[PDB]
Amino acid sequence: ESADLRALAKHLYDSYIKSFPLTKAKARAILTGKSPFVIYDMNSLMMGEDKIITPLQEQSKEVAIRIFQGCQFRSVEAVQEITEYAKSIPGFVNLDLNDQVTLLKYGVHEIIYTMLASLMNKDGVLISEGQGFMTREFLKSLRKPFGDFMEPKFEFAVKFNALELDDSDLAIFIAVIILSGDRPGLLNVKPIEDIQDNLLQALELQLKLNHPESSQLFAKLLQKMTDLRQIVTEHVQLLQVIKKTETDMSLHPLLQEIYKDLY
Numbered sequence: 001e002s003a004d005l006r007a008l009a010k011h012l013y014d015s016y017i018k019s020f021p022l023t024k025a026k027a028r029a030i031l032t033g034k035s036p037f038v039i040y041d042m043n044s045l046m047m048g049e050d051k052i053i054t055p056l057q058e059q060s061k062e063v064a065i066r067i068f069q070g071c072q073f074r075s076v077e078a079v080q081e082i083t084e085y086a087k088s089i090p091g092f093v094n095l096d097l098n099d100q101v102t103l104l105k106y107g108v109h110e111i112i113y114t115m116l117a118s119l120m121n122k123d124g125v126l127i128s129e130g131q132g133f134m135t136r137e138f139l140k141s142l143r144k145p146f147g148d149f150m151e152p153k154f155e156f157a158v159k160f161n162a163l164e165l166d167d168s169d170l171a172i173f174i175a176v177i178i179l180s181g182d183r184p185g186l187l188n189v190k191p192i193e194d195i196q197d198n199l200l201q202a203l204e205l206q207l208k209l210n211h212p213e214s215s216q217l218f219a220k221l222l223q224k225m226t227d228l229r230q231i232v233t234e235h236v237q238l239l240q241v242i243k244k245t246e247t248d249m250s251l252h253p254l255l256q257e258i259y260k261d262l263y
């Protein structure tokens, strides 16, 4: 029933609003003008780092290393809030715990990038809960291989943002991503597909109601999941070049655990 689906949509949204201080609405409100300092080069980064506690040993490290060490902090927090949102998805806590961990290891960064897109435009990304703006070309200018981390997230975000989703849309779309039945190592595929198919109905209903003059938005949205797997795939391959060139780069053990036996 359309009444059941709108209930599921509403449930996911209320749960999404509860778990994620980063919302498209707030991000868009900052990019609309409804103030942030701009890091566009080395000089402006140093000025800006002050205006956004880390040990002195970590502070004395290379700029490139420091930028990706610090994003890690918001990253692991995202993985925790994403994990809690997952549990609030009907049926998920009833999956086998091995399958719960597997969907979540494969899914968290696709969601992180989906939510990250709200903060990017074709020129830069809102940082520090919207207080700052770091440019895409300055990220590209970082020492190799660091200059290559972010550029494929920008290319996705420009296209993902062109669809003008609401948070109420994204609440369902990210639930769909977590409950993907074809992740490697899933024991019970069909209970997972059982929930997702029902989530794909909610998402379809939600797009027809929220985007009535856009007939194939659903199709475009579902394809972006291919973009996200490719961005994770690329991102992980880059982490190993970072294990071979960089050593002092302090990876976070939860990120280590997620990136084990993955793609």
Ligand SMILES: O=C(O)c1c(Sc2ccccc2)c2cc(Cl)ccc2n1Cc1ccc(Cl)cc1
Pocket (backbone or CB within 6 Å): 066, 067, 068, 070, 071, 072, 074, 075, 078, 112, 116, 119, 125, 126, 127, 128, 129, 130, 134, 139, 150
């Ligand atoms: O903590 C931040 O605000 C931040 C950071 S941390 C940071 C930012 C600028 C200078 C030093 C550290 C970050 C780094 C990159 Cl390459 C891209 C986006 C970044 N952001 C924005 C961001 C938003 C959400 C999430 Cl999960 C991670 C990062």
Ligand SMILES: O=C(O)[C@H](Cc1ccccc1)Oc1ccc(-c2ccccc2)cc1
Pocket (backbone or CB within 6 Å): 020, 021, 022, 023, 026, 027, 030, 074, 075, 077, 078, 081, 082, 112, 115, 116, 119, 126, 128, 129, 130
């Ligand atoms: O610091 C945090 O707890 C979160 C972590 C998080 C990151 C991605 C998805 C879910 C959670 O990161 C944020 C990133 C941006 C923002 C934000 C807030 C207001 C306007 C724009 C961005 C808030 C939190």
Ligand SMILES: O=C(O)[C@H](Cc1ccccc1)Oc1ccc(-c2ccccc2)cc1
Pocket (backbone or CB within 6 Å): 068, 069, 071, 072, 075, 076, 109, 112, 116, 149, 242, 249, 250, 251, 252, 255
């Ligand atoms: O993998 C992740 O969770 C993050 C994702 C992310 C990266 C930038 C902005 C928002 C999210 O990307 C990273 C890139 C490099 C590193 C890192 C940290 C310490 C040592 C080596 C690499 C950690 C995270």
